[PDB]
Amino acid sequence: TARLQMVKVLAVLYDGGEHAKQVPGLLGTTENELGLRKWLEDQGHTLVTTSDKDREGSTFDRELEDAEIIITTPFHPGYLTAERLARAKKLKLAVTAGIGSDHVDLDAANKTNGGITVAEVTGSNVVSVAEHVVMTILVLVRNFVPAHEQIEAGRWDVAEVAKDEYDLEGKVVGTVGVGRIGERVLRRLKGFDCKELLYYDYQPLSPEKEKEIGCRRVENLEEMLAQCDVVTINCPLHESTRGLFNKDLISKMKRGSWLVNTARGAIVVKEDVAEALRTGHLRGYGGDVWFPQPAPADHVLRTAKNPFGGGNAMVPHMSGTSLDAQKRYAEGVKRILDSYLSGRFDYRPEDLIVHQGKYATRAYGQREDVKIP
Amino acid sequence: YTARLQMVKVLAVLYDGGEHAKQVPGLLGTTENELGLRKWLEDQGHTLVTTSDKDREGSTFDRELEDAEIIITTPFHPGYLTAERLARAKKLKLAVTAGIGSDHVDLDAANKTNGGITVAEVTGSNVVSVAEHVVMTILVLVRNFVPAHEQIEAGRWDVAEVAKDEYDLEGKVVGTVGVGRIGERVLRRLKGFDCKELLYYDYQPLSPEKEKEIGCRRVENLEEMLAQCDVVTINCPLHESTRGLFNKDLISKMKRGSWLVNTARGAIVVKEDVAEALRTGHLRGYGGDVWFPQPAPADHVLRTAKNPFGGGNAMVPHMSGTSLDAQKRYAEGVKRILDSYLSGRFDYRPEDLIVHQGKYATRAYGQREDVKIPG
Ligand SMILES: NC(=O)c1ccc[n+]([C@@H]2O[C@H](COP(=O)([O-])OP(=O)(O)OC[C@H]3O[C@@H](n4cnc5c(N)ncnc54)[C@H](O)[C@@H]3O)[C@@H](O)[C@H]2O)c1
Ligand SMILES: NC(=O)c1ccc[n+]([C@@H]2O[C@H](COP(=O)([O-])OP(=O)(O)OC[C@H]3O[C@@H](n4cnc5c(N)ncnc54)[C@H](O)[C@@H]3O)[C@@H](O)[C@H]2O)c1
């Protein structure tokens, strides 16, 4: 089979500065280029890498016009808008170094250059994220942040921070989405003797997995939220989840409940989360995802607190780019590139989001006209 | 029929809840709420004096302990029952810990005081709370949460800066020093995380059945275990053989870049040695909730010590065992222990007893001859 020749690859990755020189395990950076440069160049392909992706006349905007393959990463996402896709005359393959391709306008991608392939490294960092969810649940429930601040400030007042400290044992935790991440969140929660583990997804777990993990499907989202002490969002960003967690839906959660979001920032309405915290309807919010990214320096969820001055466990978008995760998604990007560059187009079907002008996944909403290859 | 004891003076040393304990009645373990004991004691004709004033020369604790028959302490704000104080406690018969860990009592001195006083604690009351806090703290350290949250609140954004020290717990080896009620519950919570191995070191082992259920392996030598672990968690009591156990020499057997968690007692580590190991990068992190002494002095080195990247500190005040869920259980348990004494039945749960009738009543405070387990 004839290999494709002299393919222009454009990678939009985060700037690792001195960190990426000092810690070579930062593969997903403009410095280390996912370990791809020599492997591409030895085949006669070219690689252009940038972190400059947001401003008018950005390097991304110039280079995308003749890139055949565009590698993006959700931690520093080159937004492939309809406007940009219309200028990307050579684009055939959009590879996400990570999981979650919602920074691509997938409807526009299906109408671009005959229908481009949008692929991501399915399963590469799902464990990383599930760990981060459980961590964030415990940090919020146990009131870690203001307690650690009290220590670093030289203070000592056990009652001040114990007054909002709970145990996770005996609490009800619900996941929105029970795919690779949500299932792994419930598998890590099992050992904590929560009162119940609940999920909401139009793609259910098998009865065998329900019994093994010890969890229950709730058919209505609002009915699940009303039963939970903790809610974790683990679904992709698509038209029906954008702004899903607005004031009306957050009002269905219990007063004093804890919300975790390691999915996508735009699934919540940031002002509505900030207001719920401000009034004490939420005890806490945490996670690692923001809209847009980089998160603006004045984004309200950097500093929003509950009425006790706690309840914020936000971090930069990092869970999916742990050093352990990066080794796996760097390897997976190479595998997806090799499928295309070899001329075999022998993608893992689970890596495909859109392909040949159609959605190739069930996970971006309940659709007609999905073609699983 | 057994005659109840009469007009017993009870002294409780608890933390000051200030306005918090008025606003949140679930803060039972405070001078405000008195573990919900006051009416229950007073209706029997007993007296209760409660204080947070326990450290200064001529403290309320020092005055009242001289004729208290029962002294209730709490590890979060511990009235240290030193040999000097026990020698002045002329009426003391029962020392009850509101919580778990009675090392703030000189237990050797307690065995020689007033014919051997009973030292009891509420075994099992907050062991889940602590085990949760351990797993949380392990994850916070391994995933580099603290400096990442600080970056966000400061208005900054640099993924590489904090991802460069962010690992997954999957595939790491975790060891526990102690596999009693907390250590076993830590391993039960780690099971779902697909650690490479779960290890323990304890002279009281798990049953083979429990080892296979949880999926863990006993290591016979402590230094051997430390050299294999990426994460170590300390879950044993404070006694002569564990005081200063985690000194520079033992910490040097841990892997470079390892994470150390201590929710047991502060004095099990040598704080200057932990700070030095962190500062040179031998530890990537230290965290937990316990300090020596308590309250932790404002300048305690572990409030502010960091790894060379400016992270690696997940310290909190002594709080894990005093979650609102825990306080309900240890308040109820203190009442149960008090009722055993005040009823004249002395029908304590054997597992609640630390020393009793002049002898250690537990195997958990070191390997001893002259341990008398009741039953
Ligand atoms: N924070 C990070 O670093 C990080 C990294 C990986 C993935 N993610 C995000 O997490 C998402 C999920 O990852 P995954 O590996 O679990 O995906 P997955 O496709 O295995 O599972 C997602 C599940 O969400 C369900 N879903 C879709 N819409 C839903 C809705 N309205 N309500 C409930 N469930 C719904 C789907 O049916 C599916 O089962 C990704 O799409 C990405 O946005 C974040
Ligand atoms: N941070 C908190 O709020 C909090 C709350 C409760 C308990 N604690 C501390 O945790 C300790 C453990 O509580 P637990 O409920 O698990 O007690 P436990 O008695 O069930 O178990 C303690 C175990 O440690 C073992 N041990 C003793 N010396 C050891 C040594 N040198 N090496 C290894 N193992 C050793 C014992 O054999 C025993 O199995 C308490 O004594 C207390 O000091 C902390």
Element (H, E) at B259: strand B258-262
Residue type, A102: D
Contact present, B182 and B235 (Cβ < 8 Å): yes
Question: Which residues, including other chains, have CB under 8 Å from residue A223's CB and lie 6 or more apart?
Answer: none
| Integer Cα distance of A154 and B146 in angstroms | 17
Is B71 among the annotated ligand-binding positions? Answer: no
How long is chain A? 373
CB contact under 8 Å between A148 and B316, yes or no, is yes
Q: How far is CA A69 from CA A36, B145, B173, in A?
A: 13, 34, 39
Point out the ligand nearest to the CA of residue B244.
Answer: 2
Tokens of residue B84, six digits? 């000097």
Whether the CB of A297 is below 8 Å from some CB of chain B: the reply is yes
Residue type, B117: I
* DSSP letters spanning A168-215: STT-EEEEE--SHHHHHHHHHHGGG--SEEEEE-SSPPPHHHHHHHT-
| Integer Cα distance of A212 and B296 in angstroms | 44
Q: Report CA torsion sign: B176, A183, A263, A279.
A: negative
B84 burial (CB, 10 Å; 0-12 / 13-18 / 19+) is exposed
| Integer Cα distance of A130 and A135 in angstroms | 9
Residue whose C-alpha is closest to residue A26's, from A293, A331, A334, A324: A324
Helix locations, B259-375, DSSP H: 271-279, 324-342
CA of B140 to the centre of ligand 2 (A): 22
CB contact under 8 Å between A322 and B193, yes or no, is no
CA-nearest residue to B328 within chain A is A166
What's this structure's resolution in Å? 1.2
Q: Which residues pair with B10 in a beta bridge?
A: B48, B70
Ligand 1, atom 4, residue with closest C-alpha:
A320
Residues of B in Cβ contact (< 8 Å) with A54: none
Tokens of residue B143, six digits? 């995933």
Fold (topology level) of B127-321: Rossmann fold (3.40.50)
Contact present, A197 and A227 (Cβ < 8 Å): no
Shortest distance between the Cα of A114 and any Cα of chain B, in A, equals 35
Fold (topology level) of B9-125+323-360: Rossmann fold (3.40.50)
Whether the CB of B83 is below 8 Å from some CB of chain A: the reply is no
Fold (topology level) of A8-124+322-359: Rossmann fold (3.40.50)
Q: How far is CA B344 from CA A101, B6, B110, B227, B358, in A?
A: 71, 10, 20, 51, 19
Q: How are strands ordered across the β-sheet holding B217-218?
A: B217-218, B197-201, B173-177, B231-234, B258-262, B283-288, B313-315
Ligand 1, atom 42, residue with closest C-alpha:
A100
Ligand 1, atom 29, residue with closest C-alpha:
A235
Shortest distance between the Cα of B7 and any Cα of chain A, in A, equals 31
CB contact under 8 Å between A315 and B76, yes or no, is no
Q: Which of B232, B236, B268 should be mutated for ligand 2, with most atoms under 8 A from CB?
A: B236
Helix (H, G, I), strand (E, B) or coil at B8: coil
Q: Is B121 in the pocket of ligand 2 (CB under 6 A)?
A: no
Tokens of residue A274, six digits? 């900030």
Q: What are phi and psi of B275, to 5 degrees?
A: -60, -45
| Integer Cα distance of B116 and A102 in angstroms | 70
Residue whose C-alpha is closest to residue B70's, from B7, B9, B3: B9
Q: Is B289 in the pocket of ligand 2 (CB under 6 A)?
A: yes
| Integer Cα distance of A205 and A216 in angstroms | 9
Domains of chain B, residue spans: 9-125+323-360, 127-321
Produce one character per residue of B5-19: b if its CB has 16 or more CB atoms within 10 Å, e if not.
Answer: beebbbbbbbbbbbe
Ligand 2, atom 18, residue with closest C-alpha:
B180
Contact present, B259 and B141 (Cβ < 8 Å): yes
Among residues 16-45 of chain A, which lie with CB inside 8 Å of chain B? 16-17, 19-20, 22-23, 25-26, 29
Q: Dihedral angle at the C-alpha atoms of A120, A122, A128, A134, nearest 10 degrees?
A: 110
In the numeric block, the tokens 């090392």 are attached to B103
Name the pairing type of β-strands A358-359 and A352-355: antiparallel
Residue whose C-alpha is closest to residue A95's, from A355, A321, A318: A355
Q: How far is CA B13 from the centre of its chain?
A: 17
A139 burial (CB, 10 Å; 0-12 / 13-18 / 19+) is buried
Q: Is A119 in the pocket of ligand 1 (CB under 6 A)?
A: no
Q: DSSP E strands: which ranges in chain A? A: 8-12, 46-50, 69-72, 93-96, 117-120, 172-176, 196-200, 216-217, 230-233, 257-261, 282-287, 312-314, 352-355, 358-359
| Integer Cα distance of B137 and B143 in angstroms | 10
Fold (topology level) of A126-319: Rossmann fold (3.40.50)
Q: Is A103 in the pocket of ligand 1 (CB under 6 A)?
A: no
B249 burial (CB, 10 Å; 0-12 / 13-18 / 19+) is exposed
Q: Is B291 in the pocket of ligand 2 (CB under 6 A)?
A: no
CB contact under 8 Å between A19 and B135, yes or no, is no
A145 burial (CB, 10 Å; 0-12 / 13-18 / 19+) is buried
